[PDB]
Symmetry: C2
Subunit: 348 residues, 2 copies
């Protein structure tokens, strides 16, 4: 199935005739345009057009699989107006600002603007072989940088300096850090989104490193926890249980498995090991964004299929004491899975 | 004048009784909360309240000058509903997503939601002595890092590696790069927003370095152009004219000067030196955001006053050949100006 043929049935079930595409990830997904913050796409009964300005004329001609209309707003959607006369036009209500919607409403007085909220969640969940290649390249960069920086994670080093070393190397390679880096040591490990602080790593700490590369527009995401010196018996028990949970959830990945059931497997296991209040979401899709569909929460209705790329990231957090998360990036295959993130997972 | 007493007359002239504050910069400006992406503020006839969730209970108690209501959405604006019954409630239409507006409309069925578009532009233009202190600290960091990295800007070095060296040092100091770094060498100097590429700097190039630090939530912004070796006679003429324009526009800064008239001074001067098609905006306010009010375009109606912090950044760009921009960060004083960015401006 082409990407447009994935989208149009969704729009039909949403009760709209057209879609104004404003989320940069979906502009790029549909058209191939890589400066998508400055493009928009109109999907309509007449076909699909990329709108961008004359700074991008050559780039858009080289990249876009869609015909182009070159202008700045508001000429872009005034030119579009004829195409959407009398139509129900969906828009991405979680992306579009009210001011932008007002502009469209003024431009399209004979259309009905229809808010789509979660409607396109998971639109991009199944990746093509080309997209998987770009995700592999990003994760391979992240693994290389993690391997290079790992020896530097020792007593006396600040969390922040570890983060600087990772960022430095990702940038020099032509990528960048995919999200604000987490290097969470000692009691900072109890913070699931504890961005690298000035705390000095000390003997006896666990250190949680959550990192990804964005490279060529595609993202990776992994987490490792390592010991500096000898951790407490309690923190070793926590680490072992989190690793056990991660390995069990990964081992259930296959087409047709329910995301919510993966979450249940991990929470039952953590509960069995005394951490039934310590762990939230088990993971998320990764692609043009770090966090995208599917979602691995207990309430999720998502169902995995081959070609999706997700994370599995159980964690347990003891406030004031410590915490552990271990996370891998997984490709769903036709009869199981492939782990894309290859950095070592150590004993503690 | 307190910040709230700057805001309320604006709201009165906008025809609203209250304001739902969603832009992180304005949440922080009004309340002092530093994790403002996860706070919101309701300004109303009853006073003003910061809304944030229980992850931030202690932080918000320590930081906020405003009473707090602790909950997640949608409890936050359902709790707010009683306060806005029968009122015209403004919201920030350039910040708020349509989905967020729909949520407010459902929560506040007996209020009238009123879109404010450019209404709050320049709300934060006049800085307090405390805010000026934070901007000085950010620019002082940027100047230190620029001085450290300057010798590394030589033939054989990639644009990207210069950017990495700046970023590395800003991060290790506890700040970060304020915006995607521009290191634009040779023909890349014709690109006003040419992010640092893999191009190798060579003898005979000019190199334009546009950088800022974000530190403690406040931003800086400057640009220097330097010669590596001997530039062409033409590129030297361009450099000298841009410096002349920057120094003339800066010298006109004072309370009461019109932003548009500063722009005219710079464009007339560039025109007199043969660059009347080569140069756009002359500059912008800087504070909690890199680009904020006032605006120094030919159409601007802004009028400078003491305590504003702006940039002056004339440039001339020759596609396929080269380009020059020179930019300084300026405090408006009671009878003139003070240049906050102190890095050397060199001859070429
Ligand atoms: Zn993740
Ligand atoms: Zn992660
Ligand atoms: Zn600037
Ligand atoms: Zn600048």
């Amino acid at each position: 199935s082409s990407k447009m043929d994935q989208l149009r049935p969704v729009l039909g079930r949403a009760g709209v005739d057209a879609l104004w595409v404003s989320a940069p990830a979906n502009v790029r997904w549909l058209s191939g345009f890589t400066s998508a913050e400055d493009g928009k796409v109109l999907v309509s009964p007449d076909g699909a057009t990329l709108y961008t300005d004359a700074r991008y004329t050559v780039q858009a001609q080289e990249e876009s699989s869609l015909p182009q209309y070159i202008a700045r707003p508001p000429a872009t959607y005034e030119h579009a107006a004829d195409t959407v006369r009398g139509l129900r036009v969906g828009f991405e209500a979680e992306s579009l600002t009210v001011a932008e919607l007002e502009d469209l409403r003024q431009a399209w007085p004979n259309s009905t603007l229809v808010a789509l909220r979660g409607t396109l969640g998971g639109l991009r969940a199944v990746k093509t072989p080309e997209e998987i290649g770009a995700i592999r390249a990003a994760q391979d960069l992240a693994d290389r940088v993690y391997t290079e920086v790992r020896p530097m994670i020792r007593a006396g080093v600040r969390e922040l300096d570890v983060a600087v070393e990772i960022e430095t190397r990702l940038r020099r390679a032509g990528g960048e850090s995919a999200f604000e880096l987490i290097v969470a040591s000692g009691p900072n490990g109890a913070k699931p989104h504890g961005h690298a602080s000035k705390r000095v790593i000390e003997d006896g700490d666990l250190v949680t490193i959550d990192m990804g590369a964005r490279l060529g527009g595609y993202n990776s995401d992994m987490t490792r926890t390592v010991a500096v010196g000898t951790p407490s018996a309690e923190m070793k028990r926590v680490y072992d249980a989190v690793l056990e949970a991660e390995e069990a959830a990964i081992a259930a990945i296959r087409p047709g498995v329910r995301a919510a059931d993966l979450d249940k497997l991990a929470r039952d296991l953590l509960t069995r090991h005394g951490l039934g209040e310590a762990f939230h979401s088990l993971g998320h899709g990764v692609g043009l964004e770090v966090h995208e569909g599917p979602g691995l929460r207990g309430t999720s209705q998502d169902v995995l299929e081959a070609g999706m790329v997700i994370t599995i990231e159980p964690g347990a957090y003891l406030p004031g004491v410590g915490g552990v998360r271990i996370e891998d990036l997984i490709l769903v295959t036709e009869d199981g899975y492939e782990v894309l993130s290859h950095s070592a997972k150590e004993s503690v």
